[PDB]
Design an enzyme around this catalytic site. Structure first.
Site, PDB file in Angstrom:
ATOM      1  N   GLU A 258       0.866  -1.162   0.000  1.00  0.00           N
ATOM      2  CA  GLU A 258       0.000   0.000   0.000  1.00  0.00           C
ATOM      3  C   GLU A 258       0.882   1.185   0.000  1.00  0.00           C
ATOM      4  O   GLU A 258       1.707   1.329   0.907  1.00  0.00           O
ATOM      5  CB  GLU A 258      -0.889   0.071   1.248  1.00  0.00           C
ATOM      6  CG  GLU A 258      -1.878  -1.067   1.265  1.00  0.00           C
ATOM      7  CD  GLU A 258      -2.569  -1.254   2.581  1.00  0.00           C
ATOM      8  OE1 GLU A 258      -2.302  -0.443   3.569  1.00  0.00           O
ATOM      9  OE2 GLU A 258      -3.406  -2.214   2.587  1.00  0.00           O
ATOM     10  N   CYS A 297      -4.383   7.563   4.170  1.00  0.00           N
ATOM     11  CA  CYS A 297      -3.901   7.139   2.823  1.00  0.00           C
ATOM     12  C   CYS A 297      -5.023   7.351   1.772  1.00  0.00           C
ATOM     13  O   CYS A 297      -4.776   7.527   0.626  1.00  0.00           O
ATOM     14  CB  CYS A 297      -3.484   5.650   2.808  1.00  0.00           C
ATOM     15  SG  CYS A 297      -2.008   5.455   3.905  1.00  0.00           S
TER      16      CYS A 297
END
Lengths: 528, 529
Positions: A258, A297
């Protein structure tokens, strides 16, 4: 007399790292809080004790027995939440509501998997799909199964979610019978280590099932072997160094990444300033910029709106951002606290200066004095709103992530030939090279279905917001554990959560081909 | 004066490589067959044309339209089988029956995906699972979907299955709307290129949908981008070099690897010489050693038998192996042909010598004269059978893959107390192979096979159980059924392909769509679950 040096939990023991350690500090007040160190640990033993003892002990338990242990960790974490909120206020400088995204987000996701896990029953392997005949007489058949990987799960976790990043990953890994070694980002490692300490002290999990290392990451990947799995969250640049390690290139250990994600929000052609969908978009943009100071994020980074709607968008965002008070989260008048550290503050300031070279600043409240905080000590940054008038030729909008309360608005040219009116905006969202999430805003629910499918190949999640769900939609940036989290390309090519989908990463799939009676007996020992 | 230079099919055009090319040869007779070359091709253009032109054209079609094209390919390749068999005999030196494993195996697998895809209907994306509520009043819901990746699929395929390696991968890729660029192993590239030429000549697929490059690989991975997928089949050392490429380490392109695999066969404690399961085991080991001269990735390399069975097992194997005639596959009396090349002949012979340092050679028919073939020219290796008496302490047994008609037999200690399965030790020994594509297990007791299978499942991608009740129906240790998963963990690569619809995931991008329940309704009508 120095602040507490937090110990590591490795090979079933609490062990201090040597040397002076790394100080964690309050990003608002600058106070020294605690220290971490991994200096001198025996990392061969840490990884072997987890993989051999931790993994055998978890594998001895059925899924449902592991789930019950997750339920008990939920009850323990809830009982201690007051301690967790104190550490979040000090170490992360977040408002109480923003701390909750990490604390209670983590606990909720753990509970979701404890409930889901209870349904997996008293077995040690799961069925994947149903049986299929491999013969005209059906005497010979095939059944796929999932069996826990005989390795360890290493989590290299980002600084923004020291609680949620732990539990979102640990819950499906422990449910899967795989032992966990967590390496939280140093700057905010305190909550992760206190939660692990609380759980380890309670003796809910077997020895070896849950380990923590805080400090330097050196030598960790050197211990990873072919049946182990790794899940990394962090910068794209780090990601590429990690992926070149022999653990992956030579040993073939499974990896999830990620990384940087320039998540988009797209105001549809029909959502004009007179319609209810317009305000939903303005609000969602300001929430994503500001919750945790834009350090999710999944936060909206790029907002694409029709040419005609550009000035009304900027005016409405300016007015809503103005209500955002910034400073010390201890004062209830503060709507947005600090970034996690003064070091991150410098990366954010530097990102802002870089964007300014290609964008106009429409909004910045940096001259407003901080509430109960000194701007020369605190890692507070005011919201900043950029406008990029020519996103097709834009150099930085689509490529540079500023991990702070910063976003860029850009117009798109409405398509009113016949494709989607939003076709240009889809193209611009795709220029971000693959993202965790895009949200889309419209008054027409049916239209959002069509549009969503156009973004689905470049975004791990498409989040559609319209007046019928103003009261129920779960939020652009809020990750629901039953839904996939990850995204293609730049965002890392990773997949986690998505409910039961998360279990696959921790198991080995196998096709079993056998006499029907053999398949019948296998099936009696498995569940789905 | 020179044999045919096979052209490459790139950017919708047939283009010759420059230079003298590499010669492919008959591995029995040494005859020069054809040449390949990739020298001088514009790779950027080849990959860009496939990615935009090919991808756009395929994505424009529905799953059912794509499947109909696959069904058209099936009928074409079926029409052309005669040509395919003549190529396989000459380029691969395989018997008719063994050529059928690659030719008709590929056609069969293509056809299976053609049938499968026709059920997927007139839609452009698939539903992953069902809709799920995100809200107490159910006004907001989530549905996951799979959408074709906006990339190319590159296949870097092994020498043993020029046809099946192409079709087992191309079938799910093209059903998934992803254009295919195939790079077959040079030595046996001819069949791949002829099948691609027949399909492209036929105009069945849009231009850009299927490309082929034969010759040097240089510069191919440099063209891979973050939305492309790569499937490699070859040696572990080559896989490692490949995993390090920026295409994967910097750009994150999806990679599937199939590499060395020391697959096991385990004779159960109850399968003693007086029981029907015993003969099934002997038969299966011999078939795996000898089909294509042992050149299936899935072939049994290690056979673990109870201590008490070790002698009757060697005796029965030698008996059955002695009947395997070796030589020119043109002769109807030959049961095993050659390896793919004299270079593989040397590698296999080196591997045999390496294994003999730590194993006793129990059977070796090397001196038996070849049928219609000259041993100084042909790539015929006779079956070799090794015995390793102390597999716990052996090294080479569990680590060294010899890609020919070679296997090793080792005894295990039967466990006689009911904490454990009697085959506990054999399970441990199979695991010493560090992860394999397949293990097979043999017993008279079907129930017992189902329990044993679960013990091997976390180290093997397929567990294949053979017993008397399925003597007539079991599909073969080494034979890959397209409805079942193919790949394995660890040494075998960590890969997954085939497994029916499961193969589609590698070519799609999965997304959670969260929306008002009306929007979920409308995307639901446009998708197929």
């Amino acid at each position: 007399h120095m602040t507490e040096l937090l110990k590591n939990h490795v090979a079933g023991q609490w062990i201090a790292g040597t040397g002076a350690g790394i100080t964690l500090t309050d990003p608002v007040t600058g106070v020294a809080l605690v220290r971490v160190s991994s200096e001198g640990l025996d990392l061969a033993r840490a990884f072997s004790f987890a993989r051999e003892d931790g993994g055998a002990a978890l594998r001895a338990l059925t899924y449902a027995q592991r789930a019950a242990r997750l339920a008990d960790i939920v009850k323990l974490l809830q009982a201690k939440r007051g301690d967790y909120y104190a550490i979040a206020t000090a170490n992360s400088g977040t408002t109480r509501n923003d701390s909750a995204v990490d604390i209670d987000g983590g606990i909720f996701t753990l509970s979701y998997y404890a409930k889901l896990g209870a349904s997996l029953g008293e077995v040690h392997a799961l069925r994947d799909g149903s049986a299929e005949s491999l013969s005209k007489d059906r005497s010979f058949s095939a059944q796929h199964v999932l069996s826990p990987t005989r390795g360890v799960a290493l989590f290299i976790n980002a600084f923004n979610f020291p609680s949620w990043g732990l539990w979102a990953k640990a819950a499906p890994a422990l449910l899967s019978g795989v032992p966990v070694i967590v390496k939280p980002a140093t700057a905010t490692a305190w909550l992760t280590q206190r939660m692990v300490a609380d759980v380890v002290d309670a003796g809910i999990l077997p020895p070896g099932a849950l380990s923590i290392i805080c400090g330097s990451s050196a030598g960790l990947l050197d211990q990873i072997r072919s049946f182990d799995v790794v899940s990394f969250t962090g910068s794209a640049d780090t990601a590429a160094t990690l992926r070149a390690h022999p653990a992956f290139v030579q040993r073939g250990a499974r990896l999830n990444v990620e990384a940087d994600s320039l998540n988009s929000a797209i105001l549809c052609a029909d959502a004009t300033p007179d319609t209810p969908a317009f305000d939903l978009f303005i609000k969602e943009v300001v929430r994503e910029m500001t919750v945790k100071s834009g350090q999710k994020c999944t936060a909206i980074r790029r907002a694409f709106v029709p040419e005609a709607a550009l000035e009304p968008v900027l005016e409405a965002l300016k007015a809503k951002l103005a209500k955002i008070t910034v400073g010390n989260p201890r004062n209830d008048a503060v709507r947005m606290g600090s970034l996690v550290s003064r070091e991150q503050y410098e990366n954010v300031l530097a990102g802002i200066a870089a964007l300014r070279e290609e964008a106009v600043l429409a909004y910045d409240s940096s001259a407003v004095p901080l509430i109960d905080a000194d701007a020369n000590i605190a890692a507070c940054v005011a919201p900043h709103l950029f406008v990029v008038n020519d996103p097709d030729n834009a150099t930085l909008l689509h490529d540079v992530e500023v991990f702070g309360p910063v976003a860029s608005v850009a117009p798109y040219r409405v398509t009113t030939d016949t494709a989607l009116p939003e076709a240009h905006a889809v193209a611009l969202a795709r220029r971000g090279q693959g993202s965790l999430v895009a949200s889309i805003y419209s008054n027409d629910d049916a239209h959002l279905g069509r549009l969503a499918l156009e973004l689905a190949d470049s975004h791990g999640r498409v989040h559609a917001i319209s007046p019928s769900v103003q009261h129920s939609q779960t939020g652009h940036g809020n990750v629901m554990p039953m839904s996939l989290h990850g995204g293609p390309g730049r965002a890392g090519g990773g997949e986690e959560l998505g409910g039961l989908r998360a279990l696959a990463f921790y198991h080995r799939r196998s096709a079993i081909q056998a006499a029907s009676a053999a398949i019948g007996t296998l099936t009696q020992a498995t569940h789905w």
